[PDB]
Write an enzyme that holds these catalytic residues in place. Structure first.
Site, PDB file in Angstrom:
ATOM      1  CD  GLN A 137     -38.084  74.900  59.552  1.00 56.64           C
ATOM      2  OE1 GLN A 137     -37.815  74.730  58.364  1.00 56.64           O
ATOM      3  NE2 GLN A 137     -37.823  73.992  60.480  1.00 56.64           N
ATOM      4  CB  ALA A 138     -36.779  81.677  60.305  1.00 54.19           C
ATOM      5  CD  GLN A 186     -38.006  76.944  63.692  1.00 51.62           C
ATOM      6  OE1 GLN A 186     -37.191  77.761  63.266  1.00 51.62           O
ATOM      7  NE2 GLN A 186     -38.003  75.673  63.320  1.00 51.62           N
ATOM      8  CB  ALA A 243     -40.096  78.274  47.724  1.00 47.23           C
ATOM      9  N   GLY A 300     -34.178  81.362  53.438  1.00 51.80           N
ATOM     10  CA  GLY A 300     -35.146  80.372  53.027  1.00 51.80           C
ATOM     11  C   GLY A 300     -35.913  80.780  51.787  1.00 51.80           C
ATOM     12  CB  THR A 356     -41.360  80.316  52.434  1.00 53.63           C
ATOM     13  OG1 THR A 356     -41.755  79.060  51.872  1.00 53.63           O
ATOM     14  CG2 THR A 356     -42.606  81.096  52.815  1.00 53.63           C
ATOM     15  CD  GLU A 379     -42.354 109.741  70.467  1.00 51.24           C
ATOM     16  OE1 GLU A 379     -43.458 109.220  70.726  1.00 51.24           O
ATOM     17  OE2 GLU A 379     -41.799 110.563  71.225  1.00 51.24           O
TER      18      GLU A 379
HETATM   19  N1  GTP Z   1     -32.608  83.074  64.005  1.00 53.65           N
HETATM   20  C1  GTP Z   1     -33.245  81.984  63.598  1.00 53.65           C
HETATM   21  N2  GTP Z   1     -33.162  81.600  62.277  1.00 53.65           N
HETATM   22  C2  GTP Z   1     -33.805  80.491  61.849  1.00 53.65           C
HETATM   23  C3  GTP Z   1     -34.552  79.735  62.736  1.00 53.65           C
HETATM   24  N3  GTP Z   1     -35.080  78.699  62.054  1.00 53.65           N
HETATM   25  C4  GTP Z   1     -34.690  78.783  60.763  1.00 53.65           C
HETATM   26  N4  GTP Z   1     -33.887  79.881  60.623  1.00 53.65           N
HETATM   27  C5  GTP Z   1     -33.271  80.360  59.374  1.00 53.65           C
HETATM   28  O1  GTP Z   1     -34.006  79.874  58.272  1.00 53.65           O
HETATM   29  C6  GTP Z   1     -33.158  79.699  57.160  1.00 53.65           C
HETATM   30  C7  GTP Z   1     -33.644  78.551  56.280  1.00 53.65           C
HETATM   31  O2  GTP Z   1     -34.988  78.727  55.884  1.00 53.65           O
HETATM   32  P1  GTP Z   1     -36.160  78.031  56.729  1.00 53.65           P
HETATM   33  O3  GTP Z   1     -36.705  79.003  57.741  1.00 53.65           O
HETATM   34  O4  GTP Z   1     -35.636  76.785  57.389  1.00 53.65           O
HETATM   35  O5  GTP Z   1     -37.314  77.624  55.691  1.00 53.65           O
HETATM   36  P2  GTP Z   1     -38.098  78.743  54.852  1.00 53.65           P
HETATM   37  O6  GTP Z   1     -37.639  80.120  55.259  1.00 53.65           O
HETATM   38  O7  GTP Z   1     -39.581  78.581  55.069  1.00 53.65           O
HETATM   39  O8  GTP Z   1     -37.725  78.424  53.319  1.00 53.65           O
HETATM   40  P3  GTP Z   1     -38.078  77.006  52.645  1.00 53.65           P
HETATM   41  O9  GTP Z   1     -37.389  75.889  53.386  1.00 53.65           O
HETATM   42  O10 GTP Z   1     -37.613  77.007  51.211  1.00 53.65           O
HETATM   43  O11 GTP Z   1     -39.571  76.807  52.699  1.00 53.65           O
HETATM   44  C8  GTP Z   1     -31.778  79.438  57.734  1.00 53.65           C
HETATM   45  O12 GTP Z   1     -30.828  80.237  57.073  1.00 53.65           O
HETATM   46  C9  GTP Z   1     -31.853  79.851  59.188  1.00 53.65           C
HETATM   47  O13 GTP Z   1     -30.938  80.890  59.421  1.00 53.65           O
HETATM   48  C10 GTP Z   1     -34.636  80.118  64.065  1.00 53.65           C
HETATM   49  O14 GTP Z   1     -35.295  79.452  64.855  1.00 53.65           O
HETATM   50  N5  GTP Z   1     -33.979  81.246  64.496  1.00 53.65           N
HETATM   51 MG    MG Z   2     -40.849  77.031  54.364  1.00 56.92          MG
END
Ligand code: GTP
Ligand code: MG
Ligand code: GTP
Ligand code: GDP
Ligand code: GDP
Ligand code: MG
Lengths: 433, 55, 66, 432, 42, 436, 426
Positions: free
Chosen positions: A11-12, A15, A92, A136, A138, A247
């Site tokens: 998800q991070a 985004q 996950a 997260g 994943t 480089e």
């Molecule tokens: N810097 C930043 N971190 C994000 C953002 N969105 C989610 N995160 C990070 O993502 C982490 C949580 O995991 P998610 O990205 O929500 O979901 P995932 O990585 O796909 O893992 P799962 O939910 O188990 O599928 C948090 O610790 C956040 O720090 C974002 O827009 N910017």
């Molecule tokens: Mg996910």
């Protein structure tokens, strides 16, 4: 000819991919429909189509449909190819074992198929850029065997790694140390260079600098996109002194086990505070060295600067760059190692950074992005080792990893491996005999 | 570009026609269900009338 | 935000199921090796076997360059 | 793509779920007829979690109503939103249980499970990728506690690698609406601890206290209590069906709140509950949501966390808001009351954010807490159970319907073992 | 109404159920008569 | 002068023939009445498929053989009632009903004389015959049994004429019958000794292709038979239209078949894409030539990464140039995933045709600039045969359904003999695939 | 071209037979007069299967009505559709069988087969290519079970290479509408096992179950039960008279159902049957048909398939539908349930698809399932035949008509062997 492949995981990752690709579209003047209203600077990122259309060279991967479907029904629904957006069915859910063993094996085939198609379209591929988060499920798990399979399939391709580290104080989960420790084998062995950022530091930057009282993930991801654009703008745009993906790896990675830089950007100031401020080259390169403008909650005065890479954009002069470097080098506050007398790499680019509508940054004439490799990362790793061993003492949350496929010895061997990685940094940074 | 646009326009028209036909079928089904409910009510009333006449 | 231009206008009429796409071959059709006699207005790439057929087993047909 | 199958056990389960389906039908824009009358394209993006498609644009819930006394079935079917449920999903027995756990579990409730598991299988393999099962019941009755636990123990053996949520109305400390409610509660908890993935304890003392002191209502009928319970039930599963910046499913909440498989009892809370008088005298802010969530008054169980230690905390927020202030406020409340949290876990709090608030509301939040203050409830129920069992009260009713005398002793042993485990995990130290 | 397994209805206000004899024997021959009358005299 | 005779046997044959002949009529511009509006001579491209009457009508060179009338009468009543000849639609009275014995020994002997008479008339009309194309299915009674003695008689009547065989193989997992392995073993003699080149396809792979490529959630037999018709059109277009380097039937038989016992290629077509995904992809030569090699795009449920490639025949149509053909083949030859045998160093045959493929209105595919069809002879078919020998042995272990086959006229020796023939044909492939 | 001759025996055969010809006269648009009043031209494409052409565009059925008493034949002729039958096809005696197998097979039914085979030979030779015959009777009576098995063994010696179907109504476990029911039921199953190609076991207990918990009828008269049977008789042969994507006749289903010649007892079902209240709560999809088709509450025989192993299974769909979704569902039920299907036959289920659904309905399906659990039917009769026979109850009504007593012991050993053929395949 020169081109990069973006791989966004989680998800991070999705985004940050949205916020990066909006900036790329506005930077190359491509509409959300994909057509240029009308020079091959787009060829690093976009690919031509038989309908006169440009398709990005990016792969969005996720184990849930909720965040990809917003991309699929958003403003950029026409731009993305419908098969570049890979989705599972069940996520996950903050588990390394779920993301690595049970759930990743159903979509690893499709992801490798699309990666093979994109790399076959690539006439010359600079490398992959992997955008992911440790916390997260994943990003912790699926990314591990993704890079493990990519290392086997591709020999010496570059794999840059933009990763989200947990913050020292705030967190969005409880098993974040468990999910962050177990990735320190993949990001150690099967990664070429790995920039780490954490969100609390960028919260501090946006609060103190841009006068935003309530930042969001959009206001963070736009800064991350600005950093990535300033890194890749040397490839994309012509400049006085070009720098390449191979480089700065050559000029910043001295040992194969030491590939964890720090990424800083300057100037990050608002439109009202940019109106009264004369931003010279020295005035933008002095802010990169300040500990209050670092993007990781760590202080480099405890550590030693091992290597530095500066990337300048805009109305910038090599004479003033050299004068600013000379003024930087005479400070006792900033310490360099004895085994690196000339520690700087300099890249200069002509095109100024592009302002986005609705954004928070200001329209500026010159800017700088710094990748500094230092020894102030062992504190950030030990501050997480306290949490991980404090949790692992009582075997909390560990049945949620053991019952899904992995044995319990992986915890101990990952902790010992990253402990040895921590130990190596001290003899790297110690003074010579 | 022109060929792909014309092909997907014709596909959209075909799907719209199919949707209209399905809507007509559902309306006829609703009418039959209403008639069946009315007939059941009528039969129950006639049965009660016959029992009352016998008593 | 802002204004986005629509799809570019077609300079010539286009209709699928009837129109032949351009090839290098159809741009340079009378100048290629392997192209037979051109007597069809639909496509120049349809076989004309007026010359190759024997003098027996031949209907009334027009020989090339005659 | 993640379906939740709803299970209703007992008269209490039927009333709570009959309010719950009305609340989420109004949330998703469903008329009493069954069609969709809404003003958004976002309400049908994820509607397959709770509703099955029908013809003509109708949606029918994926719920089953199990009872042994058809009076509650008639009351549900004659209600306002009673014409939405499919007529086959009412499974009604012919003879009641009569507040008897033995009658619920062995004599009369052993013949209904065939039909119930038939209907549950028909609604279970109808889904594409089923997420899990949910149950609503009360441990003080005969059908919800007596046979709902049998249904749990059957469907978990049928589907091992799924998730099971329960909303249990565990007995009140002062009301005692049934003489044999500690018998029923003990013999139900002894099964729940082994066969349940998540348990949520709901107390009528807490609901009465909230609806009297907070909402300032003169007549707190069971409609308002079921509304509060259903608001919590809807706020738990909001990220499945509404998109947000940080998603969270039931599996993720179980992962981040259940450190050990026997510790899965939670206390819930809801955040913005304010009265008509104090509605205009309050500004909607994240501190005013976190304060009201973490206030010990607003708990939906009659247990006080000042006697215990928060093992884990989960918070689900609803509304357009700032990640900075969310993380700042919850770090601040973690830092301030430093003695009400355990020391062997850092970052005890999981946070989630969903974009879409409930109707007529701007911001809201939901709290789910795993603490050691729940062993007070088990100790009270165990002391009343052993208060009757030495004098052998009411025991002929349970013994003459197929129960041995060792069942009660092993229930006592399991309950005492659970409370001793909770006590040791409270008193555990960092140094080892 | 469509012709279906559950859509059948019957008249309740019928009181004469007399079965007329259309098949019989005359001399030694099995004869079949035209059914000039229904069930009950109607 | 060049001519091919189409023979469609069974319900599958009749339906594939309908979908093929609609495409042929639309490609050559012939109306359903049978007349070309475009007569403003000079055109001969239809002489491979259509025979011209002096009244202005074009009659196909196809024979629709069937043992039931329920699907031939649909052809006789539908849109193309005036196109086909009245006597080229041969129909019986009672079908074989999933019985090789009924289709081979009892029912087929009544109409085999009529079928051979019409075949004799068509081949007498043909002034030079490239060959026959037999469209049939292995599972069904008529396609399993009548086709066997039809080809037994055709081998005696016509000596050296090519007999290409488009066969529907049983799918490994899904199916529509239960005596289907019993029928599919017994044709392994008539597809081994009395056939020149046998392309086997099965419905499950084409279901997968129409699912993940065209985005049709509920495909049907029309959607499958359209793809099969596209394959046959891409094979025959080198005969019908002018091209840069033409390929004849005998020519790619020579360049594909290395031994007389080994004549089982695999057919693949690219690109199979929808009109929504034709907007986001360029269909270059180097990208349409890589989709043919993907195991997900194969039209048989078999994985060619397990086997060894023995020969390849590629047929390009449209805006395709020899420079890009050679560059793409050079790219393919360097991959270590695709493996060739050691005794075939030059493993490719290449044909190029000028005219791009046509589209049918209301169809599923998109109007494309170029296309490619690949016939690859490999070793990864023995797994597809063993996956059904398992089912045949499983059934025949305790003599299920044997009385049905025995009572209509065969003996019980043909089951064991056909299984032995399949075992020998399976051993031959691994003997060839073992290197030196 | 492929004709079907209908034979009706008994009063049970006549009440089912009269409702059957009322159903397919509405599918083909035939009025009570007999003429054609329809909207499609495809309804007359294959109408020679069931009807005989007459003068003036009138169609008469190819059915012969057999009974030993005109008590039920009078009630059939006074109904709505009682004018379509040819008046020379009514065959009737003047003395009833009295629910006696001996009278209906040897004493009273032996005279009446002189007249039936004059009518059967007249209708069978008028066809172009006879597909097969069809019978509707009951095994608990005197005319259906007595003479209805005398006609089977007489038209099979004349026409051996044909298809013989029976829609036999077996006795019910607790209904027991005849005291001497197992004597007629055992001596008739002994005759069906040697002289019949396919047999469909229908039980009146199972038709009561469907009209109560599925159709929710308060007053389920026999008009509705004879509709459920007649909706299955027209679903088996719907590929003979209607085009489709994949069609299967009477012979093609018998080839794919019967692995050994003694095992030909089936269990029918129909699929889209729904109560009137739940008409709007249900979506029409192919998985909705396949779910109700395999339901154990939906079988028309009083045998539960959960107690046995499915040997072979058929389904005959109706209506325009996709061939992927049909072939996907039959695979999906076989993969999950690996215990209810035999292991030495892969892909038990056969599929057929027609294009014309019944009028007013969108989709349909007919289920034919050969199961091991049909031994439950023959074992509860063999325990009641042996219970009566060792005390020699009611034999003087059977032995007094000349029947030998070893014929009773032969009917035991043929039917006690039949349940041992079924056991070894479970
Ligand atoms: N810097 C930043 N971190 C994000 C953002 N969105 C989610 N995160 C990070 O993502 C982490 C949580 O995991 P998610 O990205 O929500 O979901 P995932 O990585 O796909 O893992 P799962 O939910 O188990 O599928 C948090 O610790 C956040 O720090 C974002 O827009 N910017
Ligand atoms: Mg996910
Ligand atoms: N690809 C494809 N296969 C078909 C089609 N129609 C039927 N089949 C196949 O044909 C097989 C069944 O045999 P049929 O061809 O229908 O019948 P038949 O060959 O005439 O044999 P009989 O029915 O006994 O006369 C099935 O396994 C289907 O896979 C079709 O339109 N396309
Ligand atoms: N919260 C809540 N509790 C209820 C409701 N209805 C009944 N109860 C409680 O349930 C208990 C009685 O449950 P009972 O009806 O006997 O359950 P059953 O035997 O399974 O039907 C009492 O203690 C009530 O306080 C309700 O609508 N809401
Ligand atoms: N399904 C069905 N069964 C019937 C009908 N009429 C009678 N039966 C059954 O047939 C059985 C007895 O048949 P019977 O009258 O002895 O037949 P007959 O001796 O040949 O005239 C009883 O068990 C009835 O339940 C009917 O219309 N439909
Ligand atoms: Mg056939």
């Amino acid at each position: 000819m020169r081109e990069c492949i973006s791989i966004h995981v989680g998800q991070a990752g999705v985004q940050i991919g949205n916020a990066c690709w909006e900036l790329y579209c506005l930077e190359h003047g491509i509409q959300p429909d994909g057509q240029m209203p009308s020079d091959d600077s787009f060829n690093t990122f976009f690919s031509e189509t038989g309908a006169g259309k440009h398709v990005p060279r990016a792969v969005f991967v996720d184990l849930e449909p909720t965040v990809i479907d917003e991309v699929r029904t958003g403003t950029y629904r026409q731009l993305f190819h419908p098969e570049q957006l890979i989705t599972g069915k069940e996520d996950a859910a903050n588990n390394y074992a779920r993301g690595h063993y049970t759930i990743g094996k159903e979509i690893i085939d499709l992801v490798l198929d699309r990666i093979r198609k994109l790399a076959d379209q690539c006439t010359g591929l600079q490398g992959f850029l992997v955008f992911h988060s440790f916390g997260g499920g994943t990003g912790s798990g699926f990314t591990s065997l993704l890079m493990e399979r990519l290392s086997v399939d591709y020999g010496k391709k570059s794999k840059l790694e933009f990763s989200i580290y947990p913050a020292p104080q705030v967190s969005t989960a409880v098993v974040e140390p468990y999910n962050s420790i177990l990735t320190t084998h993949t990001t150690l062995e099967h990664s070429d260079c790995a920039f780490m950022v954490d969100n609390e530091a960028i919260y501090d930057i946006c609060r103190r600098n841009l006068d935003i009282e309530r930042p969001t993930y959009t206001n963070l991801n736009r800064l991350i996109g600005q950093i990535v654009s300033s890194i890749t703008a040397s490839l994309r745009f012509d400049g006085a002194l070009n720098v390449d993906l191979t480089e700065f790896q050559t000029n910043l990675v001295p040992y194969p086990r030491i590939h964890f830089p720090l990424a800083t950007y300057a100037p990050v100031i608002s439109a009202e505070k940019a109106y009264h401020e004369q931003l010279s080259v020295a005035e933008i390169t002095n802010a990169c060295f300040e500990p209050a403008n670092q993007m990781v909650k760590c202080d480099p005065r405890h550590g030693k600067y091992m290597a530095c890479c500066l990337l300048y954009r805009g109305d910038v002069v090599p004479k003033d760059v050299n004068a600013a470097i000379a003024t930087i080098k005479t400070k006792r506050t900033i310490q360099f190692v004895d085994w690196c007398p000339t520690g700087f790499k300099v890249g200069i680019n002509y095109q100024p950074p592009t302002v986005v509508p609705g954004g928070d940054l200001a329209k500026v004439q010159r800017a700088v992005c710094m990748l500094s490799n230092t020894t102030a990362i062992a504190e950030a790793w030990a501050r997480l080792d306290h949490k991980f061993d404090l949790m692992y003492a009582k075997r909390a949350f560990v049945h949620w990893y053991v019952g899904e496929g992995m044995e319990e010895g992986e915890f101990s061997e990952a902790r010992e491996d990253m402990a040895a990685l921590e130990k190596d940094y001290e003899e790297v940074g110690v003074d010579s005999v | 570009r022109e060929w792909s646009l014309q092909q997907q326009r014709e596909w959209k028209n075909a799907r719209a026609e199919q949707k209209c036909a399905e809507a007509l079928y559902t309306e006829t089904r609703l009418q039959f269900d209403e008639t069946a409910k009315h007939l059941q009510k009528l039969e129950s009333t006639t049965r009660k009338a016959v029992c009352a006449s016998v008593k | 935000e802002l204004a986005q231009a629509g799809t570019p206008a077609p300079t010539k009429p286009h209709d699928y199921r009837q129109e032949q796409p351009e090839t290098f071959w159809i741009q340079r059709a009378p100048q290629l090796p392997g192209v037979s006699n051109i007597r069809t207005l639909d496509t120049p790439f349809r076989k004309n076997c007026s010359f190759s057929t024997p003098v027996p087993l031949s209907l009334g047909k027009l020989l090339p360059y005659e | 793509m993640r379906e939740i199958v709803h299970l209703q056990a007992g008269q209490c389960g039927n009333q709570i779920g009959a309010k719950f389906w009305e609340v989420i039908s109004d949330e998703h824009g469903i008329d009493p007829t069954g069609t969709y009358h809404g003003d958004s394209d976002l309400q049908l993006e994820r509607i397959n979690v709770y509703y099955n498609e029908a013809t003509g644009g109708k949606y029918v819930p994926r719920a089953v109503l199990v009872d042994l006394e058809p009076g509650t079935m008639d009351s549900v079917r004659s209600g306002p939103f009673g014409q939405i449920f499919r007529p086959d999903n009412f499974v009604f027995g012919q003879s009641g249980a009569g507040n008897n756990w033995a009658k619920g579990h062995y004599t009369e409730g052993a013949e209904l499970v065939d039909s119930v598991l038939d209907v549950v299988r028909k609604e279970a393999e109808s889904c594409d990728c089923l997420q899990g099962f949910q149950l609503t019941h009360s441990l003080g009755g005969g059908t919800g506690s007596g046979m709902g636990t049998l249904l749990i123990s059957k469907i978990r053996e049928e589907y091992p690698d799924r998730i099971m949520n329960t909303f249990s109305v565990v007995p009140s400390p002062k009301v005692s609406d049934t003489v044999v409610e500690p018998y029923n509660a003990t013999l139900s908890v002894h099964q729940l601890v082994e066969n349940t993935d998540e348990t949520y304890c709901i107390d009528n003392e807490a609901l009465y206290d909230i609806c009297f002191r907070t909402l300032k209502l003169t007549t707190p009928t069971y409609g308002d209590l079921n509304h509060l319970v259903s608001a919590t039930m809807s706020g738990v599963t909001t990220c499945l069906r509404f998109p947000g910046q940080l998603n969270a499913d039931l599996r993720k909440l179980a992962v981040n709140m259940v450190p050990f498989p026997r510790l899965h009892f939670f206390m819930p809370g809801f955040a913005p509950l304010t009265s008509r008088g104090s509605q205009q005298y309050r500004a909607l802010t994240v501190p005013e949501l976190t304060q009201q969530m973490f206030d010990a008054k607003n708990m939906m169980a009659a247990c006080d966390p000042r006697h215990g230690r928060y093992l884990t905390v989960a918070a689900v927020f609803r509304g357009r808001m700032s990640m900075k202030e969310v993380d700042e406020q919850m770090l601040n409340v973690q830092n301030k009351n430093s003695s009400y949290f355990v020391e062997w876990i850092p970052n005890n709090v999981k946070t989630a954010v969903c974009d879409i608030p409930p109707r007529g509301l701007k911001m809201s939040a939901t709290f789910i807490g795993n603490s050691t203050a729940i062993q007070e409830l088990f100790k009270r129920i165990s002391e009343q159970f052993t208060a009757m069992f030495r004098r052998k009260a009411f025991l002929h009713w349970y013994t003459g319907e197929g129960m041995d005398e060792m069942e009660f002793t092993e229930a006592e042993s399991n309950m005492n073992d659970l409370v001793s485990e909770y006590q040791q995990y409270q008193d555990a130290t960092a140094e080892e | 109404l469509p012709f279906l397994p559950g859509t059948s209805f019957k008249d309740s206000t019928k009181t004469a159920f007399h079965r007329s004899q259309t098949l019989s024997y005359r001399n030694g021959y099995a004869i079949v008569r035209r059914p000039t009358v229904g069930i009950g005299g109607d």
